[PDB]
Amino acid sequence: ILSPMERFHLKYLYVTDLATQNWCELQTAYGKELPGFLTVPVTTKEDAWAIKFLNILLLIPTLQSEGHIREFPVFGEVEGVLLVGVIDELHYTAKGELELAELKTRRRPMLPLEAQKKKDCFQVSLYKYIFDAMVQGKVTPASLIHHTKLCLEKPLGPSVLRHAQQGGFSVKSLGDLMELVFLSLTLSDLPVIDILKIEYIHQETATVLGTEIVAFKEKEVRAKVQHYMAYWMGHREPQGVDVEEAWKCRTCTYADICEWRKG
DNA sequence: TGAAGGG
Ligand code: SF4
Ligand code: NA
Ligand SMILES: [Sm+3]
Numbered sequence A: 001i002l003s004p005m006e007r008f009h010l011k012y013l014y015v016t017d018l019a020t021q022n023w024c025e026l027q028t029a030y031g032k033e034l035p036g037f038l039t040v041p042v043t044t045k046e047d048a049w050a051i052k053f054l055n056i057l058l059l060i061p062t063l064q065s066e067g068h069i070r071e072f073p074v075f076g077e078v079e080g081v082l083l084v085g086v087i088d089e090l091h092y093t094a095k096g097e098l099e100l101a102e103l104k105t106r107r108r109p110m111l112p113l114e115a116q117k118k119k120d121c122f123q124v125s126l127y128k129y130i131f132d133a134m135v136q137g138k139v140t141p142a143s144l145i146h147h148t149k150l151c152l153e154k155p156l157g158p159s160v161l162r163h164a165q166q167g168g169f170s171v172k173s174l175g176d177l178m179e180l181v182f183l184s185l186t187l188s189d190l191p192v193i194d195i196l197k198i199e200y201i202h203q204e205t206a207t208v209l210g211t212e213i214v215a216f217k218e219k220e221v222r223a224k225v226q227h228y229m230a231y232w233m234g235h236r237e238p239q240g241v242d243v244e245e246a247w248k249c250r251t252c253t254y255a256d257i258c259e260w261r262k263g
Numbered sequence B: 001t002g003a004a005g006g007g
């Protein structure tokens, strides 16, 4: 029988799909099975990615001269699945280190619990894993085309050529745009991320509820992703929460339909 | 197929 990727008609996954998988994998699976519970207009997928590419093309020189940017797109094939996400903030420190900052806002002025910090440390660790591959030439246009099925010489929609030529862009095909994105990622002296920072903010008080500086370890991050991707590719069954974390079920939308918590 | 969201 088919895989969860094919069952849910998915061609890629969001970075936070793997994060919530660290919360509960069964709950993530139910959200993709039962999906009803949880400035430029485009609608062809070739146009959507072209906007993402144009954003990258401006964000790279902005980062390298101004020293900081926001909402940087990231993508890359991880263990046979294209992962797609957005980094909150990238900036250079005073000592010249490239630091990724993740901003989490909480409703109540309350510390996060280790279950949530585990999920968020994994999320920012995934941003570093994908970003490092991008600027080191491990992310290629062929892998992007393989997973999304973009058509490279379908001409770009007038909405995006208009906005392209506005910021000086005599680009015509989508392949032109892709070739330029990977040149600029790999040859503009972009370093790998050195520091990972999660800040928890109660935004009505503007009070800092804690700062996590994530210790990155490539082998552990790859091991966990390999385990999590094994579900989506279809090689193992999804696991629910451990018995010590059964309190997660008290607030789960899918608590009545699930069969893990019972037995 | 905006991604993230927040426990
Ligand atoms: S009821 Fe518990 S084990 Fe089942 S999907 Fe929800 S959180 Fe996971
Ligand atoms: Na964001
Ligand atoms: Sm924005």
Ligand SMILES: [Sm+3]
Binding pocket: A088, A102, A103, A104
């Ligand atoms: Sm955020």
